[PDB]
Every structure is written in structure tokens, then in C-alpha cells.
Amino acid sequence: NSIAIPTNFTISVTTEILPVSMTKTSVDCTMYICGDSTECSNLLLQYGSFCTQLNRALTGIAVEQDKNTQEVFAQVKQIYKTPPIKDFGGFNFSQILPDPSKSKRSFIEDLLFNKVTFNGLTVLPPLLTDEMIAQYTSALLAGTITSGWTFGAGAALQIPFAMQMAYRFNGIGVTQNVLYENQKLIANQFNSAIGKIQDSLSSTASALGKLQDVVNQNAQALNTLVKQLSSNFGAISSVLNDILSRLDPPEAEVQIDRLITGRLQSLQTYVTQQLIRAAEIRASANLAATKMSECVLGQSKRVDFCGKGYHLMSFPQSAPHGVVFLHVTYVPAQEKNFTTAPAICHDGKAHFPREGVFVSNGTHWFVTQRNFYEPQIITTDNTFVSGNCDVVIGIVNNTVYDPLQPELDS
């Protein structure tokens, strides 16, 4: 007989940060192992395919960083943009829509880019510039803001944002009159919740750590790869030119075969660890591409998939080597106790709620939606009938209000 029901709510915004792409680093195993040293090259070529299968393997990693960046952001069919008048039902996107005064990043995306940090090596550029990721994320923003889920499923059909949020509230089982009766509150809760993010990313470093780890692992993998050029590996010098000065070929080609064995094992180490790391980052890029299709381009029913609390909508913000989602969630608040019953006996029939839950203020009784106490008088228009008082455990005796009988009595 005890249930608690929320009298109220908090719309909360939470930040989820996901890796999408590594640096497209590539390394010529010819110039790394040998380099301007034909006496070494003539030795190295005897080990056969190893340098070709390293160049091919790091090329596979490099191309995949652009597939990951493509599959996360490039989901949208067209580059949507907002009208000049920002009449979004009093909800305010100023922090998250792009600044025409700047790349044209948004305010929150600048605070994201502000909070993240040579021989034989190369670094290729990514295929989408940061400005193109900012245009794709502006298309995803303005699509979501003007047309709801529909741009993710066909044409970008427009809808007024006050009614878009009514679908999102209806979808979490909260009847849409709960939005309309409270829309000025809800805009202020939403706006000040993005305000808390606009503070957090300015004052505090910990959030970007999951993208900074992608950077720190790569910079440590390359420093370790370059420091392995300086190691002796049992040769008389680690400098290739020292051997190709101090020694004749009959000794120097054995000394170099120690260095080649070493410098080849440093590459096979690094390329294997980058293949493993690329699999780890690709699983986060596929998670990001999923969260964008399901939580931005849709509304997700999946519990704690798009933050704690029931998911209304979400906004992508670009970040260096990653993506950030501002997930928007109804979190229930200010619950009160009530006596409850599974059903009621009215003239011996068992009446059950059509969608709500029965609850009592100690005395009388009401139906309400489960997620927000909004008591309504128990009528035949909000109940259905099945069977009699025998079959239900704990059925209450209370009146049902017939809504025809006052009209018919006239």
C-alpha cells in the first residue's frame, strides 16, 4: 500500500565526452631503421616484407581515423541552419549554436578546444578540418532544434520548440500538459543547466581528461619510438654513421645487423600497440556514432545510456579528436508518500487505471500519471473494468464518478 510520486522535476544537462580519432601518425620504416645509409638498406632489404607490412598496417590505422570521424559526425543529409529570430519557446541555445564572429565554433566548443594540449615520422592531416566538424555539428544542432527527430528519419519537418519538448515529455510518460503549464520554469531550468556547463569547462580540467588520454598515449608512444633510435642493442654504437666510419664492411655489417634487429623490434612494438589502440578508439567512435543516431537524431528509451534521468534530447559539440554530448534529462524531484491500491471495487466490479496509478491523500482517492502527481477524479474515462472483488489482492472500496450521469440528469 505505499507509493511515492514526484510532485515536481529538474531538467538537468550532463556532459558525455567520447574519443573519436587518433592523430594520423605514419612512420617510414626505411628512414627510421636506416636513412641516407645504403650499406644499411642493402642489409634491411634481406628481412623482406617486414617494412612493407608495417607501412601498410599504419596506413590502415590512418584511413580508419577518417572513417571514425566521418561515421560520428557526417550522419546528417544537409547543412541545416536556424532562422535569424531565435524564438525557440524561451529555451536559449546561445552557448551551443555557432558564433558568426569567429572557425565558427560555438561558445562551449571553444571552451572544449581551449582545454586539450622528427626523422622518418610523418603526421597526415585529418580529412574534415575543425571548421568542417563545426559545420557538421551546427547542422546536427539546427536540425535537432528546428525539426526534432525527423531530420534523422526523412525530411527536416519543422515544429515549434515548445511542442517539440511536448513530444519529448510525452515520450517519457509525463503527460504533455505538464510541459505547457510550466514552460517558463523549464526554459529557466534548461538555460541555467547549460550555464553550469559554461562555468565547468572554464574553471575545471577533469572533463576533457578522456580526450587528453588519447593525446598523452600517442605522445608517449612516439617519444618511446624515437628514444629507441638512441639504444645500442649490443652494437658498438647506436649512431649508424659511427659504424659507417669506424669499421670496414666485414665487421660493420654484423654491427648493423644488431641495430636493424633492434630498430625493427621497436617498430613492430609501436605498430602492434597502435593497432591495439586503434581498436580501442574505434570502439569509442562506434559508441559515439551510436549515441548520435540514437540520442541526438532520436529520443532514447535506454536507461542511463544518455545520462541519468529520462532522456528528452541532446546536442553534439565538437572537440579536438572527439565529440561531446550535452544530454538533457528529466530527473524527477520532490516526491511525496501516498497510500495506493492496485484497483478499486465500485458496485462490485474491479476498476483499474487506464495508464495512471491510484493514490490517496489519507481520505479521498485520485488517479495520477506515475511520474508526476496530478490527481484527477476517478471517472469511467480514466479506468477500465475486469472481473470482481474476489480475484485482486488488496482492492480498495471507493466511488467511481460517472461523467454521463450529471449530463443525463439535466
Binding site: 541552419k81 592531416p125 585529418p126 578540418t129 515549434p160
Partner: protein, 66 residues
């Protein structure tokens, strides 16, 4: 030629390095052949390889009114 500095020998400097044998166009299309840093190339009208910044899609002002 990746990262080289484009007086290091129709001839052009992408952010990715020096592109030789394709014309740089004051236009944009879908990314036919990728090059990097938003540059792509394709084969177009008199035929040539052309090089350009890619286009991300048709711009669409969704006709929102409250």
C-alpha cells in the same frame, strides 16, 4: 607530395603538401577522391583532375516559425 614546401621540384600547395597535375577551383563538390585538411580531388570538364575544398551538403533553412 606530403608536407614538402612547394618550391621543391597545375602546381599548388594544399595544407597536406604540394599537389601537382590538378587545378585548384573556386568551387566545392562531394569529396570524390580524398586528399586531407578539407581538400579533395575529382575528374571534371577539356577534362582535367580538379582539386577543391569538399562540400558538406545543401544548406537548408528549415522554415521554423513558433
Amino acid at each position: 607530395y606530403q608536407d614538402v614546401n612547394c618550391t621543391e621540384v597545375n602546381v599548388f600547395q594544399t595544407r597536406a603538401g604540394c599537389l601537382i597535375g590538378a587545378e585548384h577551383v573556386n568551387n566545392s563538390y562531394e569529396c570524390d577522391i580524398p586528399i586531407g585538411a578539407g581538400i579533395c580531388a575529382s575528374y571534371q570538364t577539356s577534362q582535367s583532375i580538379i582539386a577543391y575544398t569538399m562540400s558538406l551538403g545543401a544548406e537548408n533553412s528549415v522554415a521554423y516559425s513558433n
